[PDB]
Design a protein around this ligand. Structure first.
Ligand SMILES: [Cu+2]
Ligand SMILES: [Cu+2]
Ligand SMILES: [Cu+2]
Length: 308
């Protein structure tokens, strides 16, 4: 977006404040550069993020990610971040990708600050072709954030399903990484997901299974842009439901028996479900790293086994 010069923190009233989180005029020299910067939260008390406005060049920027954390990887105005962005746990708040429609429901907030919430936003920008930077122009791309101190009646959170034992032999044509967990919490309303696999991934699917009925949360090619998609039909998860996910993999594309890791030569199977919850009851993070109901995958719908 245009290069400012005015205020990153604009106080809009007694409860609300806006945060313009923008690269400080950057010029990448190679293709597929990863730049990060951080803004300290200017309140030491609970705040709720209630809106995002992407300020992206459609020309230069491929995708952006906003995280919450309390320990940013560097303390510079900007830095290269092909590593983990935050030294502590990075809570993803907002994903934007060039070739994708970006979708919060009314009343939904991400709780930050106070004794427990994130104290820092870290913004990541994926620049694509330096061809747009032939002119040594400076990019100021990023996100505008609406912060309120007013308790929001719905509170956003992230459900992460990952499969932890991931080795596939180099020839095996189809292997399933199956994840399932019993939901033992108060209701979450699922509104968006993100699937992530490496190169041997063909399709990733996530379901709520209640009384034997498979309701689709998401299905996506995990080789397509890595951002969040909107849940076609918003879903609710309740006590007694099973969350089930399946990553379908090959051993025809790589030559050795691939193991887990962060860099791109290992194999992950992750599915990110963004939800919200009533404020009284709301958890900001949940995980599933188990397969508690492996016999129940026997009635998985056929879509989950077909790559599109
Ligand atoms: Cu990208
Ligand atoms: Cu309904
Ligand atoms: Cu990965």
């Amino acid at each position: 977006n245009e290069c400012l010069g005015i205020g990153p923190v604009t106080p809009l009233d007694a409860s609300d404040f806006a945060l313009d989180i923008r690269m400080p005029g950057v010029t990448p020299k190679e293709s597929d550069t990863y730049f990060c910067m951080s803004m300290r939260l200017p309140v030491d008390e609970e705040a709720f993020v209630i809106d995002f406005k992407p300020r992206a060049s459609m020309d230069t920027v491929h995708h952006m990610l906003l995280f919450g954390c309390n320990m940013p990887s560097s303390t510079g105005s900007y830095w290269f971040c092909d590593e983990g962005t935050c030294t502590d746990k990075a809570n993803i708040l907002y994903a934007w990708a060039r070739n994708a429609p970006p979708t919060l429901p009314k009343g939904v907030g991400f709780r930050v600050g106070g004794e427990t919430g994130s104290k820092y936003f870290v913004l990541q920008v994926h620049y694509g072709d330096i061809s747009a930077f032939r002119d040594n122009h400076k990019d100021c791309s990023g996100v505008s954030v609406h912060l309120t101190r007013v308790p929001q009646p719905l509170i956003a959170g992230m459900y992460l399903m990952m499969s932890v034992d991931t080795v596939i032999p180099p020839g095996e044509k189809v292997v399933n990484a199956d994840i399932s967990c019993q939901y033992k919490m108060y209701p979450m309303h699922v509104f968006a997901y993100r699937v992530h696999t490496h190169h041997l991934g063909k399709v990733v699917s996530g379901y709520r299974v209640r009384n034997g009925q498979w309701t689709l949360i998401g299905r996506q090619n995990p080789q397509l842009p890595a951002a969040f998609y909107p849940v076609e039909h918003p879903v609710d998860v309740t006590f007694g439901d099973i969350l089930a996910a399946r990553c379908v993999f090959t051993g025809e594309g790589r030559t050795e028996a691939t193991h887990i890791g962060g860099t791109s030569s290992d194999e992950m199977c992750n599915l990110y479900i963004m939800y919200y919850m009533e404020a009284k009851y709301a958890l900001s993070f949940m995980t599933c790293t188990k397969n508690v109901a492996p016999d129940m995958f026997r009635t998985i719908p056929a879509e989950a086994n077909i790559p599109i």
